[PDB]
């Protein structure tokens, strides 16, 4: 029986899914299954934990927004049905750009923590990485904690370290495969929830 990992926590949690062909279609299903497992362990509500789910390729698609006032069961259904892209490129810079200038353009919930879970399995072409550091620093200034999850041997290690070295909060998780997500799930959620503040008594 599932239990609320973030109980009494105030958190905006953003899931960023690598949409490149570095993940097979089945592997991408495992990634999505991970996201759903995560959501199952959260109390999704505007008053507690809010979620966002974005799949990024050369561009990005936001399947779920933080303000989307749909029932949790619906949000989890949407996440599990995110379409496989299998794009040649997954632009981390573009999706961090979207996270900075769209999702967190306005901080309407300052009393909550903001966490961006960047699930990476690829490495964007260098020409697309010109403004990467700027987006990462912009997110830091808005008190958005970016947590990189490097999956597989093709994950952009340089960018993972660039995010990690900013602050101890930006702890990076490294996995050899999507298959390892389930085993490290509870650890990851616990780390996330530990960063989130509690509601006052
Ligand atoms: Ca492979």
9 Cα: distance to centroid of ligand 1 (angstroms): 37
| CA 67/CA 181 separation, integer angstroms | 27
27 Cα: distance to centroid of ligand 1 (angstroms): 9
114 Cα: distance to centroid of ligand 1 (angstroms): 32
| CA 147/CA 36 separation, integer angstroms | 18
Residue 142 burial class via C-beta count within 10 angstroms: exposed 0-12, middle 13-18, buried 19 and up: middle
52 Cα: distance to centroid of ligand 1 (angstroms): 27
Q: Which two tokens stand for residue 14?
A: 């953003």
123 Cα: distance to centroid of ligand 1 (angstroms): 14
Q: How many CB atoms lie within 10 A of CB 48?
A: 18
122 Cα: distance to centroid of ligand 1 (angstroms): 11
108 Cα: distance to centroid of ligand 1 (angstroms): 40
Closest CA to 193 of 88, 105, 115: 115
**How many residues can be counted in the chain?**
201
* Cβ(140)–Cβ(113) below 8 Å: no
| CA 152/CA 23 separation, integer angstroms | 9
Closest CA to 34 of 165, 175, 167, 133: 175
Experimental technique: X-ray
| CA 19/CA 49 separation, integer angstroms | 25
3-state SS class at 174: strand
151 Cα: distance to centroid of ligand 1 (angstroms): 10
Name all domains of the chain by residue range, CATH numbers in brackets: 1-201 (3.40.50.410)
23 Cα: distance to centroid of ligand 1 (angstroms): 6
| CA 121/CA 17 separation, integer angstroms | 9
177 Cα: distance to centroid of ligand 1 (angstroms): 9
24 Cα: distance to centroid of ligand 1 (angstroms): 7
């Amino acid at each position: 029986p599932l239990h609320d990992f973030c109980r009494s926590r105030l958190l905006d949690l953003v899931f960023l899914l690598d949409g490149s062909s570095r993940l097979s279609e089945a592997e991408f299903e495992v990634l999505k299954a991970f996201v759903v497992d995560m959501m199952e362990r959260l109390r999704i509500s505007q008053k507690w934990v809010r979620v966002a789910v974005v799949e990024y390729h050369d561009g990005s698609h936001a399947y779920i927004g933080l303000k989307d006032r749909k029932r949790p069961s619906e949000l989890r259904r949407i996440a599990s049905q995110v379409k496989y892209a299998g794009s040649q490129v997954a632009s981390t810079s573009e999706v961090l750009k979207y996270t900075l200038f769209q999702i967190f353009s306005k901080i309407d919930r300052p009393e909550a923590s903001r966490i961006a879970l960047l699930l990476m399995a690829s490495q964007e072409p260098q020409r697309m990485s010109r403004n990467f550091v700027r987006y990462v620093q912009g997110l830091k200034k808005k008190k958005v904690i970016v947590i990189p999850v490097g999956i597989g041997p093709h994950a952009n290690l340089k960018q993972i370290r660039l995010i990690e070295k900013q602050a101890p909060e930006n702890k990076a998780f490294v996995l050899s495969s999507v298959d390892e997500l389930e085993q490290q799930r509870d650890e990851i959620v616990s780390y996330l929830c530990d960063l989130a503040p509690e509601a006052p008594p």
